[PDB]
Design a protein around this ligand. Structure first.
Ligand SMILES: [Ca+2]
Ligand SMILES: [Ca+2]
Length: 275
């Protein structure tokens, strides 16, 4: 039997699924540790590896990329879980190794690849404490080219009065995503700052794991794919909307929570964003 992770229902994805909107023909790139393409609950359409020692993008030695990918697009069938946009075209852009780290050069190569391959939506559930002109340029180019770029805000929690949002989430062109639990409370780990845009479920998220498994993970890494998935549903409904329009709609129809420094605009609601 298939189970629907709490987070999927919390952002109101099932309402669209019911209407026949599931992300068909929307190309979503998961820039992460790869995706196990052998998992029976995922369908990988393509991708590329930018990790010099791990050339197959379809082998996930970490487990993180696979878990993120399932939140976006675990298939609607009779097994496992259900993603936010189960009919999307999923691309594994491998830029992290088995240990979950990666060089900026690799990440940027992955972004360049996504632009050139006409991805509609980019998901980056990764972050570093420092930026670079090259990192900023790549994300800015993707947005200028019409791509929706979503990133995890970071797991740094609070720090006096400063922003703890990492890069690339800090860049204005990117949608920076913080995490809430099932009760809509901000997770204590979720990074904070004026750059935070939206929140999504990120505590104990059940998703796919390599080797035909399923398990829960917590983090703003788990939050970001709910938003990437959300963008894919919107585009399946409104194929001629620009990335700007998709983004404004998501931001403009959230359920407001606390202060923007901690919650951004609040929790996304895809049903309201889809008009
Ligand atoms: Ca399934
Ligand atoms: Ca922002």
């Amino acid at each position: 039997a298939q189970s629907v992770p709490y987070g999927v229902s919390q952002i109101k994805a099932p309402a669209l699924h019911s209407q026949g909107y599931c992300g068909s023909n929307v190309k979503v790139a998961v820039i992460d540790s790869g995706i196990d393409s052998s998992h029976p609950d995922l369908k990988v359409a393509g991708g590329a590896s930018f990790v010099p020692s791990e050339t197959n993008p379809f082998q996930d030695n970490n487990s993180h990329g696979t878990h993120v990918a399932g939140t976006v697009a675990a298939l609607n069938n009779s097994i496992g879980v259900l993603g936010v946009a189960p009919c999307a075209s999923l691309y594994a852009v491998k830029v992290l190794g088995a240990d979950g780290s990666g060089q900026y050069s690799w990440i940027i190569n992955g972004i360049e690849w996504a632009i050139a391959n006409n991805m509609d939506v980019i998901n980056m559930s990764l972050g570093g404490p420092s930026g670079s002109a090259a990192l900023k340029a790549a994300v800015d180019k993707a947005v200028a080219s019409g791509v929706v770029v979503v990133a995890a805000a970071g797991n740094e929690g609070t720090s006096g009065s400063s922003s703890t949002v990492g890069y690339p989430a800090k860049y204005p062109s990117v949608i920076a995503v913080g995490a809430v639990d099932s009760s809509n409370q901000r997770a204590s780990f979720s990074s904070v700052g004026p750059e935070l845009d939206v929140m999504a479920p990120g505590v104990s998220i059940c998703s796919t794991l390599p080797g035909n498994k399923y398990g829960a993970k917590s983090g703003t890494s788990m939050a970001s794919p709910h938003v990437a998935g959300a963008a894919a549903l919107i585009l399946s409904k409104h194929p001629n909307w620009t990335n700007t329009q998709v983004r404004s709609s998501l931001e403009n129809t959230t359920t407001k929570l606390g202060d923007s420094f901690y919650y951004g605009k609040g929790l996304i609601n895809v049903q309201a964003a889809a008009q």
